[PDB]
């Protein structure tokens, strides 16, 4: 059974960048629903599989990817943020960033653009290509998870579904992206990077 | 050149079902952006076509469908709503509804379910199948327009992108759908129906 | 464990409409690989589900839908054909066809159109819509199965992957469609239609 | 007006790797239809654009991407092959291949994998990423063109639609891939690589 992880900080810890109302709805309602629905779908999957019911397994895929993906993405998102966050990363990761994107600023532009470029609901990601052995930016639709659909290792994700910013920034998604950089938890991102550089 | 149509009523005319803040942002910001971006993309399309640049034409498709679709959908949505709205339709349309969906209530359930069922951004629609000569409910992702992608004639659309309801109903999309029935402009929907029954 | 079903007839039982070489390859090779690959994929899925590895379950979806769908579709296809096929259905089924498509001739043309219309690999289908309670035609891409991705109950399917006709008809898919009508097992399609008649 | 390009060689110039029957059908029939169908689609698009008919422009996208992509891909494919092909590239291109894929052998295996991996119709590609400034492998479905749907500049493409190999290799696509390496026109791929070398 999958569970909703506790937020690693207070709901208002990311203010004024992401307000408390958004954080609370985001965690207690949106993420909660993803794990609850995921557990329901996996149980139905368990039943379909035991029966060899291929039709049922296939009909269940949209719900499994959407809900399971929702859980995966938000669980990573919470850890990617921090009240003491902001600034730039250091060492090997910063090395890679400058190497793979020219500079930190060029990286910010590219990730921002990938995030602002999502038409509809989705996510912008900084990931790691284990095969090429380098960093890579990608965008995912709806709740499609980075690794399950692209094979890339998630390092930093930016949720651009409207529920992630609308109450505070309304239609101005670029202001939300500008503000989020101030709360990125580079320690966590670094951790994830070093974890796949092994 | 495409233009942003005036709303056929005051921004607060649909209260308390859809508040004025949402209507104003919805029309003046979201729809505006769709037509502005559409005009930009069509102009680029005009250039690509004159040159026989197939690659450019194809690269331009996502923006054309998204923005052009945004314009089509919202232009219909505004007319599908009315301050004096609500209740049930009459005559031939009501006939079709009962015939094709069992009853009005069964129709409401089905359209609502199609609308609540959209994972991510999208629209729920009551359309008309000219080939089969009957009504049909469908759901469209992001701004994909009903007719251009399904061939069905739009009669009644329900925008379920989060910007269409979040500020007022937050994560509770079912409350938004419950409320919207009170402002449906059945006169307009009837008009559209009789227009394709010719 | 899923198994490759024997054909209801000899490989050259459908000559000259679909030649022996095609039937043998299509069954002994194409279908064979789908069943074996499906079993392998399911096993991996059972393991991923057991560990609660969501990323793995998601990464396996393409293979499950592709191989499971290939198994579902082909199993249906073989029973939809018969050396003594051809002509038209009778009683109930014929009645429904006249009712929903105007006439048997029109229906053939409609299903032929959906089949010829597939860009790339796929399938053309005559299915039953339980909710609306009527026949419906649909086209599915690659091996996406009708019921699992659409909800319609499959009654008659036409495989338009090039491997289904290229050796004999080359690039002229319409010649293949014209020919297949001569071997359709209407007895089986009728059986399938009467089964979901609720 | 787009036109069907002549082949740079005789239909049986690539025997025994890709037989004459395949080359003739592939070029004189498949490519021929894409160019003619593309022109017809473009005309309809110019008309729809002129009227500002957005629904029509959108309904035409599938045909434009499919036929325009078919024209783009095949035009590239013919120049990527040569009776005197085979072996490996030299200088700059080879250098980049060793750099981004480890070795030429590894690169072949990577591109073979992408090509064999396509479920349904499609294409496997070696392209150039202008932003990252390196080679990249990608697979495209049906006739979706590489640059128009991905941004990568096409350098070498491998057609894995069944019509590209079924008459000769039947269901065994890997045998086709092994064979094609013997006719790759590295002179042309090198030319394409040096052209986007900015
Ligand atoms: Mn979210
Ligand atoms: Mn909207
Ligand atoms: Mn087949
Ligand atoms: Mn081809």
From Swiss-Prot, chains A, B, C, D:
Induction info reads:
Expression is regulated by KRIT1.
Superkingdom of source: Eukaryota
Posttranslational modification, per the record? Nitrated under oxidative stress. Nitration coupled with oxidation inhibits the catalytic activity. Acetylation at Lys-98 decreases enzymatic activity. Deacetylated by SIRT3 upon exposure to ionizing radiations or after long fasting.
Principal location = mitochondrion
Residues modified to 3'-nitrotyrosine:
34
Q: Which UniProt keywords apply?
A: Acetylation, Manganese, Metal-binding, Mitochondrion, Nitration, Oxidoreductase, Transit peptide, Ubl conjugation
GO MF terms held by the record = DNA binding; enzyme binding; identical protein binding; manganese ion binding; oxygen binding; superoxide dismutase activity
Xref: Gene3D superfamilies: Fe,Mn superoxide dismutase (SOD) domain, Iron/manganese superoxide dismutase, C-terminal domain
EC numbers listed for it are 1.15.1.1
- Note on how the cofactor is bound: Binds 1 Mn(2+) ion per subunit.
Main enzyme class: oxidoreductase
**Cofactor(s) needed by this chain:** Mn(2+)
Q: Quote the subcellular location field of this record.
A: Mitochondrion matrix
Residues reported to bind Mn(2+): 26, 74, 159, 163
GO annotations of cellular component type: extracellular exosome; mitochondrial matrix; mitochondrial nucleoid; mitochondrion
**PTM annotation (N6-succinyllysine): residues:** 44, 51, 98, 106
Substrates-to-products reaction catalysed:
2 superoxide + 2 H(+) = H2O2 + O2
Sites where N6-acetyllysine occurs are at 44, 51, 90, 98, 106, 178
Q: Which disease is it linked to?
A: Microvascular complications of diabetes 6: Pathological conditions that develop in numerous tissues and organs as a consequence of diabetes mellitus. They include diabetic retinopathy, diabetic nephropathy leading to end-stage renal disease, and diabetic neuropathy. Diabetic retinopathy remains the major cause of new-onset blindness among diabetic adults. It is characterized by vascular permeability and increased tissue ischemia and angiogenesis.
Q: Of which family is this protein a member?
A: Belongs to the iron/manganese superoxide dismutase family.
Q: What is this protein called?
A: Superoxide dismutase [Mn], mitochondrial
| Species per Swiss-Prot/TrEMBL record | Homo sapiens
Gene encoding the protein: SOD2
